[PDB]
């Protein structure tokens, strides 16, 4: 339906994994970005997404299992999202493609990481795009992770899914 939706924006983002796959930290993780333990044991770790999942896989999924993983953890930051009352009445005024770039910062930082723009938010919240673009920018979630923070403020900024057209 959508050439570009929430699953492929934070695939770009956050790397989709069809394997377990093990970070610098031990922590065994599937799908987009989805922690399955912070142990550094691929049994438990396959054995965790085996109850996850409903089938006895050795370590490999598929896309779809991986999306139905993905939209039960987009389902809870939208539950995070409408649960802060900070956050709360922006996903509301923003349009479907905004709440995507919405959802994204909550992925990687946490609901209440995105509840510290405050100054930022007040400029979405007032469909201030551009101007929440510059306050966006001049941020420590820009420094640290410039390209993944132009793409998610260019997607406030057009609503056009256009920085993610190809990865």
């Not at 109850?51 to 779809?64: A, M, S, Y």
């Not at 991986?66 to 987009?74: K, L, N, S």
């Not at 992925?107 to 795009?129: C, I, P, T, Y």
């Not at 920018?137 to 793409?151: E, L, V």
Request: with cysteine; charged share 25%.
């Amino acid at each position: 339906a959508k050439v570009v939706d929430e699953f492929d924006m934070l695939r770009v983002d956050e790397g989709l994994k069809l394997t377990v796959y093990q970070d610098h930290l031990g922590y065994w993780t599937v799908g987009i970005g989805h922690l399955l333990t912070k142990i550094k044991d691929k049994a438990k770790a396959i054995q965790i997404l085996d109850n996850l999942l409903g089938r006895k896989t050795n370590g490999v999924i598929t896309e779809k299992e991986a999306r139905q993983i993905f939209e039960g953890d987009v389902k809870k930051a939208i539950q995070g999202i409408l649960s802060n009352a900070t956050l709360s009445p922006i996903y509301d005024i923003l349009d479907e493609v905004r709440r995507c770039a919405l959802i994204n910062m909550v992925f990687q930082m946490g609901v209440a990481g995105v509840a510290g723009f405050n100054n930022s938010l007040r400029m979405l919240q007032e469909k201030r795009w551009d101007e929440a673009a510059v306050n966006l920018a001049q941020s420590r979630w820009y420094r640290q992770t410039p390209n993944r923070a132009k793409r998610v403020i260019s997607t406030f900024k057009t609503g056009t899914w256009k920085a993610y057209e190809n990865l």
